[PDB]
Amino acid sequence: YTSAGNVTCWYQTGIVVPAGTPTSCSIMCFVSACNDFSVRLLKDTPFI
Amino acid sequence: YTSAGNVTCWYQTGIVVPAGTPTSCSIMCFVSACNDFSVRLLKDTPFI
Amino acid sequence: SESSIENFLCRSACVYMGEYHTTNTDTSKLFASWTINARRMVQMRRKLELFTYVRFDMEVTFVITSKQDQGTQLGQDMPPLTHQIMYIPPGGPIPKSVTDYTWQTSTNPSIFWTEGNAPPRMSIPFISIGNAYSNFYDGWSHGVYGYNTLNHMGQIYVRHVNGSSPLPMTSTVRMYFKPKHVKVWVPRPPRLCQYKNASTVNFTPTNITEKRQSINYIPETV
Amino acid sequence: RVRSITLGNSTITTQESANVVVAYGRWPEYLKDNEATAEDQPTQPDVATCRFYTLESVTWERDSPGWWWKFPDALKDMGLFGQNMYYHYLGRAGYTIHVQCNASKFHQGCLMVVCVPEAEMGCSQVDGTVNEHSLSEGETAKKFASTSTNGTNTVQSIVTNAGMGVGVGNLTIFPHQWINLRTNNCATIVMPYINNVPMDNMFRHHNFTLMIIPFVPLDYSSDSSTYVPITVTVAPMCAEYNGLR
Amino acid sequence: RVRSITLGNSTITTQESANVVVAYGRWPEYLKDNEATAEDQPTQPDVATCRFYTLESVTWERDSPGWWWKFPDALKDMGLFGQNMYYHYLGRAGYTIHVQCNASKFHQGCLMVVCVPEAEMGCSQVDGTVNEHSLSEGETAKKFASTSTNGTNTVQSIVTNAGMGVGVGNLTIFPHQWINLRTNNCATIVMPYINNVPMDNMFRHHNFTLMIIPFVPLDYSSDSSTYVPITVTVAPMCAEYNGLR
Amino acid sequence: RVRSITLGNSTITTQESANVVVAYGRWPEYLKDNEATAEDQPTQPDVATCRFYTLESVTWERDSPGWWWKFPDALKDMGLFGQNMYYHYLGRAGYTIHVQCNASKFHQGCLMVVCVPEAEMGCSQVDGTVNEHSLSEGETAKKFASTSTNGTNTVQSIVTNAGMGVGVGNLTIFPHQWINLRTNNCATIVMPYINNVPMDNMFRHHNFTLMIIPFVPLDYSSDSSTYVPITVTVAPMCAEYNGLR
């Protein structure tokens, strides 16, 4: 109900550690725009 | 009762690990021939 | 130099020995037949399995010996016997009696030979609508696993060339086969288990090698 | 020192320090033009066959004998490359296979990754015949066993004979790569099209077989993860079919 | 980044990133020709003296004070180089010494490896004299102690005075190398022949002494190995004897 | 692959593989000569302002929300640079900031290090005003909180709004650096002088604010150290004051 692309991530193997290291961990995502970005029709923002 | 050379392996020090790593381990051997190898008098093999 | 492909594979061997009579009451004992493949000779099979694709010509020589049956009748005076050796290409008519019409078809090449002379010999080219033969096929015939129809190589049939009401005789033929002008592709590991039948790769599990005393054991030096 | 590779609308990331095996020295390519000039005209998709397809990961535990896949038909449900398998009567293609592991410096183990042409397999019963389901299950892997198997119509899958009747230490004769958790975790194999005819039908013949086999089992200690994931990614190269017009 | 070195019928393997100390800037060499031209003609074996000889490994545990060897006569049972010690009345040689450790990234410790010329040692009794057995045992190492020793005819082997009456932190004045388990595990020292005469007899004089001394003791935790092995390998260089004809 | 840097009578050691952020592309420099030629003559100390000043380390534990410092007046007790703050009525300067961690390969965590110009902060009471002590304590760091604060005259220091009323994931708009314990442990930021006038008084205005914020908390297991130390070192650059003669 979007008509947009999507991204997903899957466990291929699983995480393997030696003795004496933390068990769980984390991933972080960063987003940005590439040089070819364009905008039109200045309007008012819906946040204030 | 061979008249052939031999190869042996000895522990010089012993294996040392930190905390949280497996204790035992393994070695593997690979064999091959070098370019100067020659053969003579085709015969029948003793395996089938 | 002795490990080249030609010197390793191009060698002659007896691959089929068969017996046939001039008169009998079975009518299948009146001729001998063989289908050409290289899977019922265990020593040639193993050397051929080191490769996945092969291409060769065939050369076949025939050694033929006769005998009068120990039945009863002696005092005979016979001329030397004549034999017919017929090759059938893939897609040819197969005889079912020794009196059949197919022993006279113009497209089945044939050899006529009489005893006392040098042994007969014919040369067959690479006969396949494919580009090579295959020793291994991971597929279905169209359904048999492991069998593809591009490996058909033909058949050989042998009979006596007498007239009507012949005298009783028994002959034995031995076929010697030799590949020539050989080319091979994609090497493979050597067969470790014994072969079980002639059409599959079936096997019973085998040990990797034989044991010794310990992982340190080296025998005392002379 | 990380490279990012995009094929079509797919993107994966590898390390630029990769090592690549080109199977027999031969890169994939089109059968050029004139083996069968007159009424044998081919076509090529080049649309969404050249793209990364990623299977499900497998789980490497302490007692894992190994895994195998058949090619093609591991891709018979994979988008367009699978559609082309049903629409066309003959085809051909080469492949690029990436295999990756996710492990730590506190794990240990060793894998062989090998691509075997014409891997004809034996039955568990010596006077029997193998079934079609026991040879492959598509994009799901079959498993080797650690002892000898039984039951009707099953491949005899004891891992020391690799289902082919040879010694498993000798499979290095084929295009292969080693993964030693100590020194690397990835392997790329580029396979060309290998047959004794130029084209063929892609449903009743298995061109080649991908096998993954642990030679030193996975080991870990106190509170590391108890498994390691393995991931396989495939990109078809220079695919080509019979023309339809 | 591994080099493989063959001397004679011996082969060992090292890392190409090795660091090498040439003792005082001087490589080994033959006394050229004409110190003693007329009736002093030498000969050189160059047969199986130039070859790697490997001693037994020693075991580094939590409380190890250190080890020492005397040169020569650590090689008086080593094949041909040892035969030549009995057949010839005078000789000389330089050496290459490799020292290696086998440890993990979960171990820690620090070793000094030093080659000391004329290492004359003191007795445990001030008005006593040292025995011949207490100075060396051939290819077996002697041990330093962590407290001061007693008994007759024994070297006073408290490790802080190194058996010579100096402060052990000052042995860096000699040709030496550090082994820090954190950053490297190997050490090569090339020693030339150093004497106040050109040749000498090899049985009643110890040219130099190799010492290995831990400055930070070995430490490990829960289920690592409890020891670390050290291995010593020696190759004689430019050996030369009195002529016999 | 270690560099040793000496400024004045100070010496610190860094790695030559460092990465350096120059804030907006602009290196620090003197306001050249002739903004205010006639009766505005400046002077420059260049004596013991160009020298490394090292604060106390902070302790990163499992639940640490973060730390912040104000510049200047984090240096109002730092030797000569602090004396010049009292003797002179106007000044200006740029800075070099080094941040370092001491951790092992068995630890894990992630820090943002950011330098924010004009970091005006909000009060914990919406109709209140912030105190001077709650904005800074000099060379001691203030602390962020993990929940919303109370009390009079205090900065509202919930860490997700960074005391400024923005989303903390968006502070990458400022000059910043990431420290991922897996890949590096150091960060250098070179800040120029940024104001809307050429000089200013250094006691009632905070030019910029240094913030250090963990985005993935510190984790360790069985018997590792339970904390990680962070160290901050500052060198003033091109400082300049009003002339006194």
Residue C6: partners with Cβ closer than 8 Å, 6 or more residues away: C182
Residue E208, class by beta-carbon neighbours within 10 Å (0-12 exposed, 13-18 middle, 19+ buried)? buried
CA distances from D159 to D42, D67, E221, F125 (A): 41, 10, 37, 72
In Å, the largest CA–CA distance within chain A is 58
Chain-chain contact of B22 with D110 (C-beta, under 8 angstroms):
no
Q: What's the residue count for chain E? A: 245
Q: Which domain, by its residues, includes C126?
A: 1-222
**Interface residue ranges in chain A relative to chain E, Cβ cutoff 8 Å:** 18-20
Residues of A in CB contact (< 8 Å) with D are 10-21, 23
Q: Do chains B and F touch (3 or more CB pairs under 8 A)?
A: yes
Give the chain F residue nearest E105 (alpha carbons): F105
Q: Determine the 3-state secondary structure of C102 from DSSP.
A: helix
Using the Cα atoms of residue E54, residue E55, residue E57 and residue E60 in order, give the sign of their dihedral.
negative
Q: Tokens 């420059």 map to which residue?
A: F44
Nearest CA-CA partner of D69 in D224, D225, D189: D189
The pair of three-digit structure tokens given for residue E239, joined into one six-digit string: 């050996």
CA distances from E153 to C125, E129, E136, E156 (A): 93, 6, 13, 9
CB contact under 8 A, F221 and A23: yes
Measured on CA atoms in the order C123, C128, C130, C135, is the torsion positive or negative? negative
Instruction: Write out chain B residues lying below 8 Å of F221, CB-based.
Output: 20
Contact residues on chain C for D205, CB-CB shorter than 8 A: 137-140
Of C101, C127, C116, C123, the residue nearest C177 (C-alpha): C123
Contacting residues of B for D220, CB less than 8 Å apart: 22
Pick A15's closest partner by Cβ from D102, D218, D221: D102
Confirm if D106 and B20 have CB atoms less than 8 A apart.
Answer: yes
**Residues written for chain C:** 222
Distant-in-sequence contacts of D200-205, Cβ < 8 A, 24+ apart: D200/D90, D200/D91, D200/D92, D201/D89, D201/D90, D201/D91, D202/D72, D202/D73, D202/D85, D202/D90, D202/D91, D203/D73, D203/D85, D204/C139, D204/C140, D204/C142, D204/C143, D205/C137, D205/C138, D205/C139, D205/C140
- Per the document, the length of chain A is 48
- What is the Cα–Cα distance from C28 to C7, expressed in whole angstroms? 39
CA distance F181 to F169: 19
Nearest 10 degrees: Cα torsion D80, D85, D90, D94: 60
Domain with D210 in it: 1-245
Tally of structural domains, chain C: 1
Tell me the Cα Rg of chain C: 22
Pairwise CA distance, residues C196 & C203, whole Å? 6
Instruction: List CB contacts of C122: < 8 A, sequence separation 6 or more.
Output: C59, C60, C85, C87, C109, C111
Please tell me the distance from the alpha carbon of residue F67 to that of residue F69, in angstroms, as a whole number.
7
CA distance B42 to chain F (A): 59
Q: Which of residues 86-115 of E touch D (CB under 8 A)?
A: 105
| E240 neighbors E44 (Cβ within 8 angstroms) | yes
Place of tokens 């009323």: F165
Contact residues, chain F, for E222 at CB < 8 Å: 222
**C touches which chains (3+ CB pairs under 8 A)?**
B, D
Question: SS in 3 state form for C154-181?
Answer: CEEEEEECCCCCCCCCEEEEEEEEEEEE
> D60-77: buried (b, 16+ CB within 10 Å) or exposed (e) per residue?
beeebbbbbbbbbbbbbe
CA D166, D167, D170, D176 dihedral sign is positive
Q: Taking an 8 Å Cβ-Cβ cutoff, which residues of chain D contact chain A?
A: 56-60, 100-107, 181, 218, 220-225, 227-231
Tokens of D86: 């049903």
3-state secondary structure of E181: coil
Q: Taking a C-beta distance cutoff of 8 angstroms, is the pair F242, F85 a contact?
A: no
Determine the Cα–Cα distance for residues E8 and C184; give it in Å rounded to an integer: 42
Domains in chain D, number: 1
Q: Scanning the structure block, which residue is given the tokens 């984790």?
A: F219
* Residue numbers of D between 213 and 242 with CB closer than 8 Å to F: 222-223
B14: left (phi over 0), alpha (psi -120 to 50) or beta: left
CB contact under 8 A, B28 and D110: yes
Q: Report how far residue D52's alpha carbon sits from residue F185's, in angstroms, rounded to the nearest whole number.
A: 36
Closest by CA position to E51, among listed E110, E91, E7: E7
D91: which 2 tokens? 């085809």
- Give the Cα-Cα-Cα angle E94, E100, E106 (nearest 5 degrees): 160
Whether E101 and B13 have beta carbons less than 8 Å apart is answered as yes
Strands D58-60 and D186-191: unpaired
Q: Which residue of E has its CA nearest to A21?
A: E106
How was this entry determined? Answer: cryo-EM
Q: What resolution in angstroms, rounded to 1 decimal? A: 2.5
SS (H, E, C) chain F: CCEEEEECCEEEEECCCCCEEECCCCCCCCCCCCCCCCCCCEECCCCCCCCCEECCCEEECCCCCCEEEEECCCCCCCHHHHHHHHHCCCEEEEEEEEEEECCCCCCEEEEEEEEEECCCCCECCCCCCCCCCCCCECCECEECECCCCCCCCCECCECCCCCCCCCHHHHHHCCEEEEECCCCCEEEEEECCCCCCCCECCCCCCCEEEEEEEEEEEECCCCCCCCEEEEEEEEEEEEEEECCC
H or E segment at D87?
Answer: helix D79-87
Q: For residue C40, which of C69, C71, C17 has the smallest C-alpha distance?
A: C17
Query: Under a CB-based contact definition with an 8 Å cutoff, are residues E139 and E55 in contact?
Result: yes
CB contact under 8 A, D225 and A15: yes
Q: Return the residue matching tokens 């010794």.
A: C212
In angstroms, the separation between the Cα of residue C3 and the nearest Cα of chain D is 18
